[PDB]
Design a protein around this ligand. Structure first.
Ligand code: ASC
Ligand code: NA
Length: 129
């Protein structure tokens, strides 16, 4: 599923992301834009052999089992494919674990490089929330 911007904002808000660990909703929307272009089906292979999955490009090295990432972990206790569903629940629950891991949203390279220090509230502007 490819989300509209405001559609994803509302879904993220309903799933408890707005100010989760102090990151306002716009941060999450901005991350999702630059990680996946709002597409739940996005996958991208990493140089180390792991793969990133879903709207927040959660990686198989640590967070999910894709059956092909030797010596990796499954810290969210889920098959990576669950991160591709049109229901974002798994991606949200797993994101919450990630953002609590010590580095906050810096865990998302694209957040740090495209969203951090920018006017992230622009991403939820005009949305009914
Ligand atoms: O993604 C993973 O891949 C391996 C295994 O399933 C295949 O090597 C593993 O233990 C994971 O969490
Ligand atoms: Na894994």
């Amino acid at each position: 599923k490819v989300f509209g911007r405001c559609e994803l904002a509302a879904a993220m808000k309903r799933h408890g992301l707005d100010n989760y660990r102090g990151y306002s909703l716009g941060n999450w929307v901005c991350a999702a834009k630059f990680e996946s272009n709002f597409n739940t089906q996005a996958t991208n292979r990493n140089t180390d052999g792991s793969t990133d999955y879903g709207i927040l490009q959660i990686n198989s090295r640590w967070w999910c089992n894709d059956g092909r990432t030797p010596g990796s972990r499954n810290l969210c206790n889920i098959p990576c494919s669950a991160l591709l569903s049109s229901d974002i629940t798994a991606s949200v629950n797993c994101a919450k674990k990630i953002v609590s891991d010590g580095n906050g949203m810096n865990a998302w390279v694209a957040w740090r490089n495209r969203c951090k220090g920018t006017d992230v509230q622009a991403w939820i502007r005009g949305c009914r929330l």
